[PDB]
Write an enzyme that holds these catalytic residues in place. Structure first.
Site, PDB file in Angstrom:
ATOM      1  CG  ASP A  81      -1.647   1.126   1.380  1.00 10.22           C
ATOM      2  OD1 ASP A  81      -2.229   1.659   0.310  1.00 10.22           O
ATOM      3  OD2 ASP A  81      -1.772   1.634   2.489  1.00 10.22           O
ATOM      4  CD  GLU A 132      34.218  14.169   6.900  1.00 11.32           C
ATOM      5  OE1 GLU A 132      35.363  13.686   6.748  1.00 11.32           O
ATOM      6  OE2 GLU A 132      33.982  15.332   7.037  1.00 11.32           O
ATOM      7  CD  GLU A 175      30.536  16.023  13.482  1.00 15.12           C
ATOM      8  OE1 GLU A 175      31.865  16.280  13.388  1.00 15.12           O
ATOM      9  OE2 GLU A 175      29.810  16.629  13.655  1.00 15.12           O
ATOM     10  CD  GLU A 210      33.176  15.826  16.167  1.00 18.04           C
ATOM     11  OE1 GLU A 210      33.438  16.792  16.600  1.00 18.04           O
ATOM     12  OE2 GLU A 210      33.694  15.629  14.833  1.00 18.04           O
ATOM     13  CD  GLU A 235      32.924  12.485  12.172  1.00 19.26           C
ATOM     14  OE1 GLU A 235      33.286  13.509  13.114  1.00 19.26           O
ATOM     15  OE2 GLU A 235      33.147  12.340  11.046  1.00 19.26           O
ATOM     16  CG  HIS A 253      32.037  18.107   7.379  1.00 20.31           C
ATOM     17  ND1 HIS A 253      33.111  18.176   7.807  1.00 20.31           N
ATOM     18  CD2 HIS A 253      31.115  19.028   7.918  1.00 20.31           C
ATOM     19  CE1 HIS A 253      33.061  18.893   8.899  1.00 20.31           C
ATOM     20  NE2 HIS A 253      32.047  19.683   8.792  1.00 20.31           N
ATOM     21  NE  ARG A 265      39.317  22.433   9.381  1.00 14.83           N
ATOM     22  CZ  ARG A 265      38.869  21.205   9.634  1.00 14.83           C
ATOM     23  NH1 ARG A 265      37.919  20.545  10.151  1.00 14.83           N
ATOM     24  NH2 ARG A 265      39.725  20.146   9.244  1.00 14.83           N
ATOM     25  CD  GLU A 302      34.966  18.517   4.901  1.00 13.18           C
ATOM     26  OE1 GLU A 302      35.574  19.630   5.177  1.00 13.18           O
ATOM     27  OE2 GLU A 302      34.953  17.694   5.490  1.00 13.18           O
ATOM     28  NE  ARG A 328      33.872  22.252   7.227  1.00 13.04           N
ATOM     29  CZ  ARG A 328      35.103  21.646   7.701  1.00 13.04           C
ATOM     30  NH1 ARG A 328      35.825  20.618   7.112  1.00 13.04           N
ATOM     31  NH2 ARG A 328      35.161  22.115   8.918  1.00 13.04           N
TER      32      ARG A 328
HETATM   33  N1  LIG Z   1      37.525  10.657  -4.062  1.00  8.24           N
HETATM   34  C1  LIG Z   1      37.887  10.468  -2.915  1.00  8.24           C
HETATM   35  N2  LIG Z   1      39.024  10.058  -2.877  1.00  8.24           N
HETATM   36  C2  LIG Z   1      39.518   9.774  -1.499  1.00  8.24           C
HETATM   37  N3  LIG Z   1      38.752   9.882  -0.453  1.00  8.24           N
HETATM   38  C3  LIG Z   1      37.392  10.328  -0.822  1.00  8.24           C
HETATM   39  C4  LIG Z   1      37.008  10.641  -2.110  1.00  8.24           C
HETATM   40  N4  LIG Z   1      35.723  11.366  -2.089  1.00  8.24           N
HETATM   41  C5  LIG Z   1      35.373  11.194  -0.878  1.00  8.24           C
HETATM   42  N5  LIG Z   1      36.611  10.759   0.454  1.00  8.24           N
HETATM   43  C6  LIG Z   1      36.091  10.716   1.757  1.00  8.24           C
HETATM   44  O1  LIG Z   1      37.089  11.532   2.749  1.00  8.24           O
HETATM   45  C7  LIG Z   1      36.580  11.019   4.156  1.00  8.24           C
HETATM   46  C8  LIG Z   1      37.317  10.904   5.408  1.00  8.24           C
HETATM   47  O2  LIG Z   1      38.006  11.111   6.261  1.00  8.24           O
HETATM   48  P1  LIG Z   1      38.148  12.280   7.683  1.00  8.24           P
HETATM   49  O3  LIG Z   1      39.166  11.987   8.625  1.00  8.24           O
HETATM   50  O4  LIG Z   1      36.515  11.894   8.252  1.00  8.24           O
HETATM   51  O5  LIG Z   1      38.136  13.976   7.249  1.00  8.24           O
HETATM   52  P2  LIG Z   1      37.753  15.256   7.908  1.00  8.24           P
HETATM   53  O6  LIG Z   1      38.802  15.806   8.892  1.00  8.24           O
HETATM   54  O7  LIG Z   1      37.185  16.426   6.905  1.00  8.24           O
HETATM   55  O8  LIG Z   1      36.174  15.166   8.827  1.00  8.24           O
HETATM   56  C9  LIG Z   1      36.009   9.808   3.661  1.00  8.24           C
HETATM   57  O9  LIG Z   1      34.541   9.946   3.650  1.00  8.24           O
HETATM   58  C10 LIG Z   1      36.582   9.409   2.461  1.00  8.24           C
HETATM   59  O10 LIG Z   1      36.312   8.173   1.906  1.00  8.24           O
HETATM   60 MN   LIG Z   2      35.199  16.743   7.676  1.00  7.93          MN
HETATM   61 MN   LIG Z   3      33.665  15.659  12.894  1.00  9.83          MN
END
Ligand SMILES: Nc1ncnc2c1ncn2[C@@H]1O[C@H](COP(=O)(O)OP(=O)(O)O)[C@@H](O)[C@H]1O
Ligand SMILES: [Mn+2]
Ligand SMILES: [Mn+2]
Ligand SMILES: Nc1ncnc2c1ncn2[C@@H]1O[C@H](COP(=O)(O)OP(=O)(O)O)[C@@H](O)[C@H]1O
Ligand SMILES: Nc1ncnc2c1ncn2[C@@H]1O[C@H](COP(=O)(O)OP(=O)(O)O)[C@@H](O)[C@H]1O
Ligand SMILES: [Mn+2]
Ligand SMILES: [Mn+2]
Ligand SMILES: [Mn+2]
Ligand SMILES: [Mn+2]
Lengths: 468, 468, 468
Positions: free
Chosen positions: A50, A129, A131, A212, A220, A269, A339, A357, A359
């Site tokens: 449904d 990422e 959290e 965190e 995280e 992020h 940042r 990234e 954010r």
């Molecule tokens: N193209 C890519 N090549 C390599 N790593 C990548 C790519 N696209 C995304 N990532 C991601 O970067 C993230 C990991 O690292 P992290 O220590 O959590 O960073 P930050 O300090 O910004 O929180 C993962 O999700 C990793 O797989």
């Molecule tokens: Mn990050």
């Molecule tokens: Mn974090």
């Protein structure tokens, strides 16, 4: 492989199959059938259910729809008492077996298709990422005579004064003081690892885990990126593991973006990059090791930020995290350092790992729709060679305050974001990925939520105006 | 086979035999005898018992009656501590060994006989979908100074504010928000599966299980259809399993149709179809894949709806579910889409699976009598070629509100339904299936119940009229 | 006299004037103005107020209306702290100053006018006997998880076992045992007299006071009859005095018709008679000293009983009093003895006091509308010479049970009564007394009330069906 599935059924002596899917809001849903109901038919024609029951889906007349098992997603549930196999499903229109306009997974798949179609790249890479918070007690309510919310955790700094049955052992992370004190200040090492082990038993690949910033259990688990749709699947599993391991440990986890005023919120992020025939389309000679394609992508994200917000920050609560703060990822700009910028450029050696990234997303976001909107904005940035402008390497929202610092910013409220999504919907409709109906339905679901918050008196309003 | 039974006694080292039967209200009853009391005689002449003890049965003079074991029903009880075999029994008149006029199972058998006799078909297929609630605490009472009812469950949305010993873990299904959030929001996965496994150990075949719409533990176990009388047997077993597995898990289950104002009630949709020599007499070239026989059947159900109500919605509470609501299955019409219509036509591919779904029944209904009344109404619809009219594909009870929308509707109160049953009894007496005495006795039992509710002040009456 | 009022203001050093009126449901309403706001204008043009605020009155566009003080009603409030004068008001249409179609007092006045107009008589006499309950504690509620009502009084028989701070003095009226035990069993002598004294200070004339049948504080103050509209005014004052004297004594009074199952309900018998130039148009040579006019009147009341019910028994609770019981005033017949008959004929000597007593009304009834409907039915009985048939002197509802005893009866539910009022409205529209709009609005107000009770699960339903 539908055969691999039939062998997993025997190998693990499976008694049930748990069919899963996600609704518009982003919440994983499920229904269970005995393993003996899994036959050849099942895979080719799925099972009927449904539609009218899920929020924002089929209305009064066209209720029935199809649950199409995706045999590639088969994985054992690590919590259920009886052996059961989880199989993610797509929602298809009956007969046509097309893929429901409002099914977030179908939408995400459509977006990956359109990527390949434009020939801009053949695969999208997402590394979110998320959290989250781990509490012991969460209480709330709202009725005509008032409302409230009470949070409690053994790590909460406020418990430094609490009397405990066996004595207060008092080693707690202070406000904004959760970044890495070793145990016993950090009370979640064992639990973060169980989450990791379980996540991996479910196909995710873990890169790291840590406490965190916020007091009271912010944590995280970092997982390896994957192709867009498979990653959104991973997010759902991720949340599932987090929620359930917490439950099994006597805790309760939440992915709300800002449960507490005065300490860190939880963000998600999103690292992204594009690829074709194994090469990273984002590495180049331009800024910080970027390709000009990456820059157009960034330009797209910046151009459509407010609309993306409606999917990446889909709750009124989301905007309590995105407020003029220092580290608030609210400035629509890029940089490899600042940042303050909602778009960071990771400085990495191997050009194979060059990426961006974004954010501002938070974990409340629907994986599928959030990732998709991010892509479509990026593509529209490319197709239309939308230049980013120059990188912001100065400072955030406060001082600056020179030219009143009115540079780009993310939406400041959910309504604003929903309105942006309304007006700025073309880039999403491209390739027939998002339909107007889908978008309008999503907006309607969220406006109803926005209304509850706008219409219900807030405790702080009493503090501020009771004696008016 | 009476021999199969004697071997099951040795194979499972059975110490007792639990003789079961159903009363007029629909409640399974039982009496136990040591296995050593099971002999050849037992099967041919049954065991004697006092009729006058069951409500609405024999009166002052003719108490004694016969319990006739039906050897085909033998199944082990999965809960009792000592090995015991359950054997369903029919109630026969002594000497004549005929089949008591007031025995609901005999009545249902008579109805299956009459089907074959008219030659219209050789077997009836019933696929009921009973829903139910699982609570933690249920309290109620009524005396001269007042009355009350208090419901409680860990899933109840109202507990979002409750203080718990080990902390409130707060992941609960909101009001009308139970349709499929994965655990931990759904707290009943393990229990729904035990119910499934046990149901199957008892001969039922499970198709699916899932949480239902209402907060506070509404759940559903979907089982495969079966021939009418065997299905009513299955309903009894179904309820038994649900009630007892719940009890063993520290819960309490109820099949009441509307335990809470403001959230979903529990219904028992009934899928039906007829067959002869293996072919589905309901598939055809007419509307939605139907035979003209199906349409006459529908016409019958619609013509006698109010009388069927007296058996399919036998409680005053039943009418708190059947109220002018949106999804209320109260409009006496058919459609393959409009879920305002109390008769849905499932859209399915294989003509072998063509059937109708009568939506207004609730789980409080006596299996036997409810199913039987549904059949007899259908047959009378056929015998008299009662045309259905055209399908309603517009809308429900509210807007419409054009022509005051006074189209057919189900009874609006128990009394009304009982009265309909009184007047419109001919179609039930056909084939000597239902006797006047049986019908009058049933009506008398329910009127006594209707009276309690009509005569006892209602809490809401104080809210509405105390300050009058 | 508007001058008499201006002198009462000085004589009692009045500081405020409390303007009173009644809404459709029958509840007295009020607004206060300083005495200094009372001038010549006040009496000729009244004061303006918002119509849209009262239930069932003006809608979205025509809010404003007029409060017209009726100087004949001036009386001092015996409870307010500051000297204040009460002045009953009629609700008039602005400009036209006619008399609002929906104003119950205007409607009652219109009915007295129409009486004089037909020339049938020049004045109507009403002698209602409202009964009531006096409790110590009344608690109730209803929410999604349940509902309840708890009554408590020092006289309640159930308290024979209650532990009290200073000891249980235990002299309480048992169930149905309140008819006249002298104190201390009767705990309300002092309070009944204060009510009497105060009622008289407010213009009523008291004939008697006594404890009624039910345990737990049922009581009654009998007042002298008066002309129809003035009596309805008296009823309002009566209720006001009862409610407030009770409050001042630490009790709480209710005019609900059936607060307890198992003991007496509260009724409001209505004695009526007509007159012209000082002679009693109801005395004659016919049955029990009646005129043939009286008989036609009775016939009218009987013909339109079900419609009158909608005004004389306007609550679902009303029907918990009118149930097949022995003394239940539910049989639509007359007699001078048979107290099964809803119409008693008092046997009295002086033909000047000949009259009829319609027994089914309850105190929840709107004075105005109830009395008016009684009159109009009587007049229509006369105008159309509706003969009564012969008097019932046999027995009530139970045995009889010979010919199934289906003789006339009052409505058995509020809905039924509302429906009767719908269909049988002509006799009320006569003379333009009741408009369709008024009637339809009244019905709508009550249907909303009827719905709450029909839709909310009843505590007894759990007792009866939880284990279904
Ligand atoms: N193209 C890519 N090549 C390599 N790593 C990548 C790519 N696209 C995304 N990532 C991601 O970067 C993230 C990991 O690292 P992290 O220590 O959590 O960073 P930050 O300090 O910004 O929180 C993962 O999700 C990793 O797989
Ligand atoms: Mn990050
Ligand atoms: Mn974090
Ligand atoms: N003749 C029939 N052929 C096939 N299935 C039938 C037939 N008659 C009844 N059924 C029943 O349809 C019901 C199952 O499906 P379900 O998923 O619960 O549907 P719904 O969405 O209407 O609640 C079962 O009871 C099934 O066995
Ligand atoms: N026309 C009339 N002449 C005399 N008394 C009348 C007339 N019409 C009504 N009454 C009323 O009869 C009622 C009083 O007596 P009561 O002792 O309470 O009788 P019952 O025993 O029926 O409750 C008063 O309301 C009285 O004024
Ligand atoms: Mn269901
Ligand atoms: Mn169904
Ligand atoms: Mn009395
Ligand atoms: Mn009386």
């Amino acid at each position: 492989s539908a055969e691999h599935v039939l062998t997993m059924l025997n190998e693990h002596e499976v008694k049930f199959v748990d069919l899963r899917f996600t609704d518009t809001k982003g919440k994983e849903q499920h229904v269970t059938i005995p393993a003996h109901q899994v036959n050849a038919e099942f895979f080719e024609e799925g099972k009927m259910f449904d539609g009218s029951s899920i929020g924002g889906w089929k209305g009064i007349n066209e209720s029935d729809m199809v649950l199409m098992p995706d045999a590639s997603t088969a994985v054992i549930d690590p919590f259920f008492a009886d052996s059961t196999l989880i199989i993610r499903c797509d929602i298809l229109e009956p007969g046509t077996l097309q893929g429901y306009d409002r099914d977030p997974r179908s939408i995400a798949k459509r977006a990956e298709d359109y990527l390949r179609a434009t020939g801009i790249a053949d695969t999208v890479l997402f590394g979110p990422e998320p959290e989250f918070f781990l509490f012991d007690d969460i209480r709330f309510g709202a009725s005509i005579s008032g409302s409230h919310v009470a949070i409690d955790d053994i790590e909460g700094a406020w418990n430094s004064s609490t009397k405990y049955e066996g004595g207060n052992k008092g080693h707690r992370p202070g406000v904004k003081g959760g970044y890495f004190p070793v145990p016993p200040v950090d009370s979640a090492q064992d639990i973060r690892s169980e989450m990791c082990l379980v996540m991996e038993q479910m196909g995710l690949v873990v890169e790291a885990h840590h406490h965190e910033v916020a007091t009271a259990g912010q944590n995280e688990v970092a997982t390896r990126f994957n192709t867009m749709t498979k990653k959104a699947d991973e997010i759902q599993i991720y949340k599932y593991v987090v929620h359930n391991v917490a439950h099994r440990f006597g805790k309760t986890a939440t992915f709300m973006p800002k449960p507490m005023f005065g300490d860190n919120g939880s963000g998600m992020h999103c690292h992204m990059s594009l690829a074709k025939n194994g090469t990273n389309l984002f590495s180049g000679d331009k800024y910080a090791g970027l390709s000009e394609q990456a820059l157009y992508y960034i330009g797209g994200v910046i151009k459509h930020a407010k609309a993306i917000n409606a999917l990446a920050n889909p709750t009124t609560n989301s905007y309590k995290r995105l407020v003029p703060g220092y580290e608030a990822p609210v400035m629509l700009a890029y940089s490899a350092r600042n940042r303050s910028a909602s778009i960071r450029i990771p400085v990495v050696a191997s050009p194979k790992a060059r990426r961006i990234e974004v954010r501002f997303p938070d974990p409340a976001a629907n994986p599928y729709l959030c990732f998709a909107a991010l892509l479509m904005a990026g593509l529209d940035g490319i197709k239309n060679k939308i230049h980013p402008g120059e990188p912001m390497d100065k400072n955030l929202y406060d001082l600056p305050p020179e030219e009143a610092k009115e540079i780009p910013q993310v939406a400041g409220s959910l309504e604003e974001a929903l309105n942006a999504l309304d007006l700025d919907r073309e880039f999403l409709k491209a390739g027939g990925v998002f339909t107007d109906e889908a978008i309008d339905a999503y907006i309607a679901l969220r406006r109803e939520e926005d209304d509850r918050v706008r219409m219900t008196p807030h405790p702080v309003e009493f503090e501020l105006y009771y004696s008016v």
